[PDB]
Write a sequence for this structure.
C-alpha cells in the first residue's frame, strides 16, 4: 500500500526501534534546518511506531523536508545502509 505520503517510508522505519528511532527523531530536531537560538521545535512529540514517525514527519514538514532532512539525520547516527537503501532504486530488499 501507498500512504498519506510515505508507503515504503515506514518499511525503513520497521528495521529500527527505540534503540535509535528515538535518537533519529531527536537528532532531527537539533539539526532542524531553521537554525535559531534554541535548537528544538515546538509541541512535544507523541509518535512511537515508525509508521507514526512517518505521518508525524510529513506534518512537521511535508515529503520534502521530511525525507531530505531524514537523509541528513542518518549521517548523524551512521546508517549508511539506510542512506543507501533510500537511493538504491530498490525499495529496500
Amino acid at each position: 500500500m501507498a500512504g498519506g505520503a510515505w508507503g515504503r517510508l515506514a518499511c525503513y522505519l520497521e528495521f529500527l526501534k527505540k534503540e535509535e528511532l528515538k535518537e533519529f527523531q531527536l537528532l532531527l530536531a537539533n539539526k532542524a534546518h531553521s537554525r535559531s537560538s534554541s535548537g528544538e521545535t515546538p509541541a512535544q512529540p507523541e509518535k512511537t511506531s515508525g509508521m507514526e514517525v512517518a505521518s508525524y514527519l510529513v506534518a512537521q514538514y511535508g515529503e520534502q523536508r521530511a525525507w531530505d532532512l531524514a537523509l541528513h539525520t542518518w549521517e548523524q547516527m551512521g546508517l549508511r545502509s539506510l542512506c543507501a537503501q533510500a537511493q538504491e532504486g530498490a525499495g529496500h530488499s
